[PDB]
Design a protein around this ligand. Sequence first.
Ligand SMILES: N#Cc1ccc2ncc(-c3ncc4c(n3)n(C3CCOCC3)c(=O)n4CCO)n2c1
Length: 266
Amino acid sequence: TIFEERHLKYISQLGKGNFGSVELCRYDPLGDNTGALVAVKQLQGPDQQRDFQREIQILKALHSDFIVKYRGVSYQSLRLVMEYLPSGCLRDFLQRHRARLDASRLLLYSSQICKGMEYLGSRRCVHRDLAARNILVESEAHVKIADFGLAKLLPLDKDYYVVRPIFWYAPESLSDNIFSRQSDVWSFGVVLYELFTYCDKSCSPSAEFLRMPALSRLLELLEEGQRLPAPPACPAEVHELMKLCWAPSPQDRPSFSALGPQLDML
Ligand SMILES: N#Cc1ccc2ncc(-c3ncc4c(n3)n(C3CCOCC3)c(=O)n4CCO)n2c1
């Protein structure tokens, strides 16, 4: 739970979240290079130092097969140590191994994410940035949700939270900065789209919405009932779930708990 700085061997850069920098390291106390690989997040202002301390505590308290595992912290500077998922980001994974991933396997990922999200909801936690770029691949048969830097905990007497990339945002989030489990559902509809386009750049959410002020443009387009199209070779039933995920009103969207069985039984 407390990883010593001098034993964390820097290997390379894994990327930047919404927030800071993530680095691949080997925690190698014995010195043999036999140590376990770990992902280490850190910052390099007070406002994000505050949100970082929350993110550490959120990930620490969450326990699920489909959420990146917290492992500890490293100290006069605070770093977050997490398990390393060596197959990397789902976005890149899908583009690389498209040829060997049929619809059944995409549904498996959808279901695993749905179960991860169902768990978050029960911990009254709103991810706020659910997207393929923030999903990680544990193995070819297993994915996990990551990056809780923008994550908010619903007040204990409220089902929404108002707050201070737009193509994953629900309408009420764009217009009124309102976020909730239901705004997470909207975004889940977009990852379904990403899964079944194999995160192809040329037909990404941005490329489609751009083809269809930018924030006000998107919002007017959504209010008109226009949506991302059915991905090619996406089963019709899955497309219908996306459409339900993108219901105009938050209350008309299905819960993650209702989606799960619908995804599993196709
Ligand atoms: N947090 C975390 C976190 C926790 C464990 C973990 N094990 C592996 C990764 C990882 N491996 C490779 C990544 C990658 N993450 N990310 C970003 C994902 C969103 O968070 C910020 C980094 C990338 O852009 N790549 C490039 C190639 O896919 N990983 C990230």
